[PDB]
Each structure stands twice: as structure tokens, then as C-alpha cells.
Design a protein around this ligand. Structure first.
Ligand SMILES: COc1ccc(/C=C(/C(=O)N2CC(=O)Nc3ccccc32)c2ccccc2)cc1
Length: 128
């Protein structure tokens, strides 16, 4: 089982903005999760070949990872914060769908998600 192409990170056809909420997603949310001891499984797309998970992309049809999110933020891919927040939540959801409760990787995702929810609770007001 081969890996699929990665999610899109560049698309000049898609309109973009640079906004204080999106800046916060990078500078606070992404950086907080990225530096966490439990980040490494989530810092790039799932490599189904290396990890010997031939069924991963048969089960997970909307893959997402922080490597992709970091590219999206750094390369200003998004129109709004909710798109980026959706990405995070897709990545968590995929983990929980694919694995079993109390698997280490589920514990790792839950720790990152706790931090994520606390940062998103303080998402700044949109500048006007
Ligand atoms: C410390 O225990 C761990 C750590 C990571 C993983 C999961 C990894 C991972 O993303 N996946 C996808 C996944 O969702 N589950 C899974 C199950 C078995 C093996 C790998 C994985 C991973 C990531 C990078 C390198 C190697 C593995 C699973 C358990």
C-alpha cells in the first residue's frame, strides 16, 4: 500500500488572507503543539509504508497533520481561522477513528488536543 499525494499546501487559485487570528494560529497554537514532547507522530503526513499501515488510507479519507498545517500557515494558504482550526480537528479525529482507546498515539493526540482547546478558547478578536 502506497502513500497518497499529500494534502494541498499551495494553490494560487485559492484566495488568501493574512489576519491576526491566522497569525495567532501560527505563533501561539501551532508553535505550542509543535514543541511538545508528543508532537513527533503528527509533524508530517502518516507514512503508511514506513509504519507498516497498509490499511491507513483505506480508513482515513481526509488525512491531515501538523507538517501540512505548518506549511499552510507559513505559506498563507487560508482565508480564515476556522479553516485552520478544522485542519487540527481533522487530524485529532483521524487519530481517534483509526486507533483504539488508550493506545499511546491516542494519549499523545489527547494531550495535544488539551493544549489546542485551551489556546483556541483565547483566539483573539478579529482586527477591523
Ligand atoms: C510511542 O508510541 C507511538 C508513537 C507513534 C505512533 C504512531 C505513528 C502514526 O502516525 N500512526 C498513524 C496512526 O494513527 N496510528 C498508528 C498505529 C501504528 C503505527 C503508526 C501509527 C508514527 C508516526 C511517526 C513515526 C512512527 C509512528 C504510535 C505509537
Amino acid at each position: 500500500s502506497m502513500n497518497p499525494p499529500p494534502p494541498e499546501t499551495s494553490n494560487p487559485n485559492k484566495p488568501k488572507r493574512q489576519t491576526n487570528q491566522l497569525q495567532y494560529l501560527l505563533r501561539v497554537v501551532l508553535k505550542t503543539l509543535w514543541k511538545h514532547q508528543f508532537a513527533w507522530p503528527f509533524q508530517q503526513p502518516v507514512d503508511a509504508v514506513k509504519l507498516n499501515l497498509p490499511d491507513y488510507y483505506k480508513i482515513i479519507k481526509t488525512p491531515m497533520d501538523m507538517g501540512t498545517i505548518k506549511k499552510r500557515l507559513e505559506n498563507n494558504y487560508y482565508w480564515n481561522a476556522q479553516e485552520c482550526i478544522q485542519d487540527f480537528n481533522t487530524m485529532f479525529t483521524n487519530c481517534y477513528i483509526y486507533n483504539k482507546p488508550g493506545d499511546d498515539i491516542v494519549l499523545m493526540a489527547e494531550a495535544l488536543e488539551k493544549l489546542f482547546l485551551q489556546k483556541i478558547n483565547e483566539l483573539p478578536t478579529e482586527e477591523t
